[PDB]
Structure formats: C-alpha cells, structure tokens
Amino acid sequence: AISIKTPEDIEKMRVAGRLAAEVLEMIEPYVKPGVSTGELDRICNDYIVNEQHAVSACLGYHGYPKSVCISINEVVCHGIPDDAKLLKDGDIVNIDVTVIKDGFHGDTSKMFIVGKPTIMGERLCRITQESLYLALRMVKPGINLREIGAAIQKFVEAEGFSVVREYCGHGIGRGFHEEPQVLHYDSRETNVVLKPGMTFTIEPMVNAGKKEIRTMKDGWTVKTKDRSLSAQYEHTIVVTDNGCEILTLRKDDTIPAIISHDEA
C-alpha cells in the first residue's frame, strides 16, 4: 500500500528533506575542476554524520560502498566516488544524496556544471530540470501518476532527448523505496490517484542520445549505451490538499516550495 503520512511524519520528512538539500548546498563550492569524486564523497559523509547528525542511506545499500553517488557526463547513475576520478572543465555531474534523520528519508540530486559549459551540457541540464519542474507543477490530489510520467516523456522527447526506462521515482518515508513507482514515461500499468499526505520522489534520468543504458564491470556504474551525456535532478515531495510541497528545495531552485492550484 501507499502510506499516508501523518502531520508529525510530514514534519520529520521536512527535516530529512532539508538536510538532504543542505548537503547539496554545502558541497557546491567544492565542485570545481581538479577535485576528485572521492573527496567530494568524503566531504558529504563527514557533513552528514558530524554536522547534521544524520546517516547516509546509500552506504551499504545492496553493498554500495560510498555515501553519495556522483555521475559525470555519460554516466547515467550510481557513479562510484573514487580518488582517481577528477572533475574537469566542461563536465556535467550529478550528485545524488539520501539522508535518514529521525527514521525518515530525504532523497535529492542535482546537476553541477564544472567550469565552462558545453552547449549540449547546458541545455541537457536545463531541460532535465524543467522536466522535473513541469511534473512538480502537476502534482495535486486526484491526478494520476500516469499523466505525470507521460508529460515528462513528451517534454523531453520534444527536445530530441530520451527518458531512461530502467529507473523510476518512488514512494519514500521510513523506507528509502516505498510504493508507488513513479515512472517518467507513459505506461498502461500506472494507475495511482494522488491523495494528500503521499510522499514520493520525481527523478528523471534524461539522455541527450538514445534511451539505452549499460552497467560497467564494476557492478555499479551505469552509462548511456551510445555514450551521450545524461542528466538527472530529483526532489522529494508531499502531496498537499491543493498541490504539493517540495521537501528538498534549495536556495538555487527556481520553483516555489509550496505549489497550490486553489483560487483559481
């Protein structure tokens, strides 16, 4: 079933979501040419543990050995922080954070552009964030999750990009992954009517090239099959009585935290 969070549960999701957003805000001035993804991981984990008094949900997840995932360029997801992998001018890089605080999870990611943007890098990051934002503006009681997936896929494909099918957003709360599955494309299997107090993520992975992906021999790193660039942004939300509240909003987001469809 899909759990409906109590007001107290929602407040705990606000705290966890704020913490996960705050990791992303904290790490920003370290994301520069020449830094290793392994150092960025250590800076995040020390912050989560020592400052936030929280835990990373990534560490030990199915045996995953690091505290965040960092995905550069044609790495779609689950890039493993490594001391030998250096950021460089023109890179696009996703940093994906999940923190557990007081039993609740907050899950969020963004792209950073390192030094001077690529014109595809700029555009792929912007359109991927806008695909997330257009989905967030659709969330309100009574809409079907299926409409939202279809809208994201229409928007991304109109820009000549593709949506990765293997991964989806998800319910979230005391579990890192709960019902429902939030697909970022249209499917006949999606039939979920949203109600106030559902909490879930929207997190499209968008390739500049074709949709197919492949996993490296390391068992974790996922890349586009065509080696096109790939981008992702993720927010955790709660459905409210007339819209949604974005639990993981950052100062650099350009969508409001509270979206309401009442008035009109």
Ligand X SMILES: O=C(NO)c1coc(-c2ccccc2C(F)(F)F)n1
Query: Which residue of 128, 201, 221, 248 would you call a contact of Mn ion, by CB under 5 A?
Result: 201
Residues in the interface with ligand X (CB under 6 A) total 12
Cβ neighbours of residue 108 closer than 8 Å, sequence gap 6 or more: 17, 20, 21, 24, 96, 97, 98, 201, 234, 235, 236, 248
CB-nearer residue toward Mn ion: 95 or 138: 95
**Closest to 140 in 3D by CA, of 33, 262, 15:** 262
182-219 CB burial, b ≥16 within 10 A, e <16? bbbbbeeebebebebbbbbbbbbbbbbbebebeeeeee
Q: Which single residue brings its beta carbon nearest to ligand X?
A: 58
| String of DSSP letters for 106-140 | EEEEEEEE-SSPPHHHHHHHHHHHHHHHHHHHH--
- Crossing angle of helices 119-138 and 145-158, rounded to 10°: 160
CB-nearer residue toward ligand X: 64 or 117: 64
CB-nearer residue toward Mn ion: 107 or 245: 107
162 binds Mn ion (CB under 5 A): no
When CB distances are held under 5 to 8 angstroms depending on the partner's kind, the choice from Mn ion, ligand X, none that residue 78 binds is: ligand X
When CB distances are held under 5 to 8 angstroms depending on the partner's kind, the choice from ligand X, Mn ion, none that residue 208 binds is: none
Task: Tell which phi-psi region holds residue 139, choosing left (phi > 0), alpha (psi between -120 and 50) or beta.
Answer: beta
Binding piece for ligand X, criterion CB under 6 A, among 8-16, 55-63, 138-146, 236-244: 55-63
Q: Where are the alpha helices (DSSP H) in 47-118?
A: none
CB-nearer residue toward ligand X: 118 or 232: 232
Query: Which residue of 107, 178, 245, 253 would you call a contact of ligand X, by CB under 6 A?
Result: 107
> For the chain, how long is the longest CA-to-CA vector?
54
Residue whose entry in the numeric block shows the structure tokens 């989560």? 48
Binding piece for ligand X, criterion CB under 6 A, among 14-22, 59-67, 237-245, 253-261: 59-67
Give the CA count within 13 Å in the CB-facing half-sphere of 16: 31
Closest contact distance (angstroms) between CB of 68 and ligand X is: 8
Binding piece for Mn ion, criterion CB under 5 A, among 22-30, 45-53, 201-209, 250-258: 201-209
When CB distances are held under 5 to 8 angstroms depending on the partner's kind, the choice from Mn ion, ligand X, none that residue 14 binds is: none
Binding to ligand X in span 109-168, by CB under 6 A: none
Closest contact distance (angstroms) between CB of 26 and ligand X is: 18
255 binds ligand X (CB under 6 A): no
Q: Are 162 and 211 in contact (CB under 8 A)?
A: yes
Residues that bind ligand X (CB under 6 A): 58, 61-62, 64, 69, 78, 96, 107, 170, 203, 220, 234
Residues that bind Mn ion (CB under 5 A): 96, 107, 109, 201, 234
